[PDB]
């Protein structure tokens, strides 16, 4: 309860008035409608031509109440569809909100931050418009204090969240100028006590690292990896998820940037990630591991030394197919770059049967990936004269009958891959 | 109905189930006309009446050649229908009865038996193998076992050749090897016959037997049929060229040695007309064959050059439908893949670049990879010659650079990696 309100006709009558009170009451009734739960008549308010009026009220420095009420109304309009957010932008709301950021009334400033957050969050287009109006300098200035704990909790959260939206989206990605300008502040918020601040900060950093290796370098150069890994071991999921995404993104970079994640001690917490109850975390963590096992041998050796191989084998055995596919990739990269002794260890961890069991999958890509892994392992066996031993293991896992079945089947890579394996390593007698 | 002709199915079963031979014959005659109806003959009604076994029994009555003939005609038409309708004839035990009728001193009845077996065997691998299992081949070949084939009637010979070709047709499984080795010698003879329809059917039989592994191709090739196939390839009758081209096309999928036997027979001298044939499906088949030829040895590629075929391939690549253009693209890739530097220089001289580049606009991911592989191969030859700059400029003058630039923003992985590789190497600053 959860009801009440005016008609859109009455509010219009009230705002077109010259009495300041009447305009305020109307703007209040506006905020009540647009804030009511739910199905607010946003489009009807727009059709009335009220957006430009609200925006003009944002400039009424001689009346904080109507500034606040108008800022609230516009925020809720901006929170809707792109068409609805665009009506707010075309109404010239952006520069008006930015002017409000420096208001001596913290609650009004906060609302402007919120509003700018919804606009920039719509997409890279409107994001760039916000930046091009010089919204960054005012925003960062609000955070330009010695101790962040002085600011209100909700205030700091909104600011962090709005900044994260200035880092969000691609095609185009945010300007390097803006990113470089924001990063130093982001580093501070990464070390704040509040969980939501940490969450939004991690999200912001996951956005900035979701690109070419040059953008990854900007982030890593500030020395945030150690902190990211700390937040990786958090108990609260809203922190771990973006933190893992950030780390995951960094690892898609170079072997040098990957090494900084390892040095930070990321590998020590990955067992809990690979065995996380949230299936989405397992996929994400398994995906990251696969890009690590695509690195140098010395990097593969650190994966071995931290004991992650049995956990990887575990994912391959008892995870949803999507996560299993990622695991399969991790093992192919492993066997591809790994030394012979690293591959032997892999086989000792019981990789074969789980690997063969996926060979019955319905997906074509994962099959190619697995046959490649099997081939790479056989290549290591030839350098040991243990070809026969490995061949025995495979039929002891029912894997041979699976390779036999792939002699048929569509696709060309599976033909020669399977065909080459039996000729080199099996063949002779079995059935015809 | 009434005491008249154009009977009802009800009147036919009555006459057939009668103890009077005269009335059984009339009924069978009426049934034959009915099944010889121009449009929608009631096959299912006749089957559903249970007349098939009665027809098959009549085939056994040597006491009455007429009813043997009429019944053989009826069953032939039922066997011509759907697989379900052909199966009803087989389940009626018609196959061994027809085979017994092959040796009939009544040639017109023997012919109709050949026809029937042809329809049945033509249904698929299963029924084909049934016909062979009942020992149909020996009697059939025994009919062709004459010193001069021109003594047999033309309708009689055409049927035999056609039925025999169906015993060679279909795969999964293919015909048994021992049966093929039994038929081939006769097949060689019919290939050298004078009748165009006989030649056509013979060529189809060969095209079937060669549609398979290299082992089955060797069975045919070592009978020395390739020279004759090439002669039939240059015929004016399209019904002969098509199967002959299919046969040749199949043989070329085999080893380099077999391909050489095609080239030694002078096949490359007729391919200019095949690659420019008015029928689009002949161009496709011919361009496909050329792609497999250019997948061969450098000396075999050199013969493709010597017979002046490269300008015709460039031609197909420029003006043919997309389906045929794809085949042409493959031929160029295999060419540039296995060819010598000199052979590739010649290819560029023939103006391959612009026609290749134009196909990068096509909405087909595979052909794009094929062309990109071809261009990469040409650049490799340009590297050795130290003229990558000259080749780079050529691509620029043929509007190729813009298209390779567009493939960088392509969904496929092989497409964008290949493009990137080419720009960095040859089209950087």
């Amino acid at each position: 309860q959860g009801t009440v309100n005016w008609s859109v006709e009455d509010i219009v009558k009230g705002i077109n008035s010259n009495n300041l009170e009447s305009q305020l009451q109307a703007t209040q009734a506006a905020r009540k409608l647009l804030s009511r739960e739910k199905q607010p008549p946003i489009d009807n308010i727009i059709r009335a031509g009220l957006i430009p009026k609200f925006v003009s009220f944002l400039g009424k420095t001689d009346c904080s109440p109507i500034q606040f009420e108008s800022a609230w109304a516009l925020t809720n309009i901006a929170s809707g569809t792109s068409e609805q957010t665009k009506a707010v932008v075309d109404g010239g709301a952006i520069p008006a909100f930015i002017s409000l950021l420096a208001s001596p009334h913290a609650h009004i400033s906060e609302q402007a931050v919120w509003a700018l957050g919804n606009i920039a969050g719509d997409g890279s287009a409107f994001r760039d418009l916000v930046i091009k109006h010089g919204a960054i300098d005012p925003l960062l200035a609000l955070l330009a204090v010695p101790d962040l704990s002085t600011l209100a909790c909700g205030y700091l959260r909104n600011l962090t969240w709005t900044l994260s939206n200035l880092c969000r989206n691609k095609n185009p990605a945010p300007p390097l100028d803006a990113v470089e300008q924001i990063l130093p502040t982001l580093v501070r918020l990464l070390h704040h006590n509040d969980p939501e601040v940490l969450a939004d900060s991690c999200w912001a950093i996951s956005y900035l690292t979701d690109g070419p290796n040059e953008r990854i370098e900007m982030v890593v150069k500030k020395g945030v990896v150690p902190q990211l890994v700390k937040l990786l071991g958090a108990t609260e999921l809203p922190i771990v998820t973006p933190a893992l995404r950030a780390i995951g993104n960094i690892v898609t970079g170079t072997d040098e940037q990957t090494q900084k994640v390892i040095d930070a001690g990321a590998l020590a917490v990955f067992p809990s990630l690979l065995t996380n109850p949230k299936t989405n975390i397992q996929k994400e963590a398994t995906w990251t591991m696969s890009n690590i096992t695509a690195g140098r041998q010395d990097q593969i050796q650190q994966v071995v030394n931290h004991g992650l191989v049995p956990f990887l084998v575990g994912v391959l055995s008892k995870a949803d197919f999507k996560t299993q596919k990622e695991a399969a990739w991790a093992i192919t990269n492993y066997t591809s770059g790994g030394t012979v002794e690293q591959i032997v260890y892999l086989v000792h961890c019981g990789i074969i049967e789980p690997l063969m069991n996926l060979l019955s999958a319905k997906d074509t890509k994962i099959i190619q990936v697995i046959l490649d892994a099997i081939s790479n392992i056989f290549q290591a066996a030839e350098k040991l004269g243990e070809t026969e031993k490995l061949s025995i293991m495979i039929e002891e896992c029912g894997g041979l009958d699976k390779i036999e079945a792939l002699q048929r089947h569509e696709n060309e890579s599976v033909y020669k891959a399977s065909l080459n394996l039996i000729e080199k390593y099996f063949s002779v007698e079995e059935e015809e | 109905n009434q005491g008249t002709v154009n009977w009802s199915v009800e009147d036919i079963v009555k006459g057939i189930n009668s103890n009077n031979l005269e009335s059984q014959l009339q009924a069978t005659q009426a049934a034959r006309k009915l099944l010889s109806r121009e449009k929608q003959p009631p096959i299912d009604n006749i089957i559903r009446a249970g007349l098939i076994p009665k027809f098959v029994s009549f085939l056994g009555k040597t006491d009455c050649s007429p009813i043997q003939f009429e019944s053989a005609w009826a069953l032939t038409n039922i066997a011509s229908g759907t697989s379900e309708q052909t199966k009803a004839v087989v389940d009626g035990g018609a196959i061994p009865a027809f085979i017994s009728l092959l040796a009939s001193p009544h040639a017109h009845i023997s012919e109709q038996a050949v026809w029937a077996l042809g329809n049945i065997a033509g249904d698929g691998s299963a029924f084909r193998d049934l016909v062979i299992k009942h020992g149909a081949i020996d009697p059939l070949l025994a009919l062709l076992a004459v010193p001069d084939l021109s003594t047999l009637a033309c309708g009689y010979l055409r049927n035999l050749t056609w039925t025999l070709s169906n015993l060679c047709r279909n795969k999964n499984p293919a015909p048994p090897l021992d049966a093929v080795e039994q038929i081939l010698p006769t097949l060689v003879r019919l290939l050298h016959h004078n009748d165009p329809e006989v030649l056509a059917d013979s060529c189809w039989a060969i095209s079937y037997l060669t549609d398979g592994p290299n082992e089955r191709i060797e069975m045919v090739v070592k009978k020395g049929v390739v020279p004759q196939l090439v002669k039939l390839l240059g015929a004016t009758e399209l019904p002969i060229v098509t199967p002959a081209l299919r046969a040749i096309g199949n043989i070329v999928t085999g080893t380099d040695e077999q391909t050489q036997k095609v080239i030694d027979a002078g096949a490359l001298a007729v391919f200019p007309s095949l690659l420019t044939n008015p029928k689009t499906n002949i161009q496709k088949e011919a361009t496909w064959t050329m792609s497999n030829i250019t997948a061969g040895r450098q000396d075999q590629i050199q013969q493709v050059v010597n017979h002046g075929l490269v300008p015709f391939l460039v031609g197909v690549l420029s003006k043919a439908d997309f389906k045929t253009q794809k085949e042409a693209a493959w031929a160029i890739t295999n060419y540039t893949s296995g060819g010598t530097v000199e052979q590739i220089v010649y290819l560029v001289h023939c103006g391959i670049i612009e026609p290749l580049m134009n196909l990068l606009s096509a909405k087909d991911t595979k052909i794009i990879q094929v062309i990109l592989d071809a261009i990469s191969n040409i650049f490799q030859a340009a590297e050795k010659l130290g003229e990558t700059e000259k080749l780079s400029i050529m691509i620029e003058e043929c509007g190729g650079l813009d298209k390779i630039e567009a493939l960088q923003r392509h969904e496929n992985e092989s497409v964008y990696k290949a493009s990137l590789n080419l720009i960095e190497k040859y089209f950087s600053v």
Binding site: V251, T252, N291, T293, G295, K365 | -
Partner: peptide
């Protein structure tokens, strides 16, 4: 070895 973006494509 092949590093891949979140969609399993490739980085390189």
């Amino acid at each position: 070895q092949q590093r891949r973006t979140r969609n399993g494509a490739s980085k390189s």
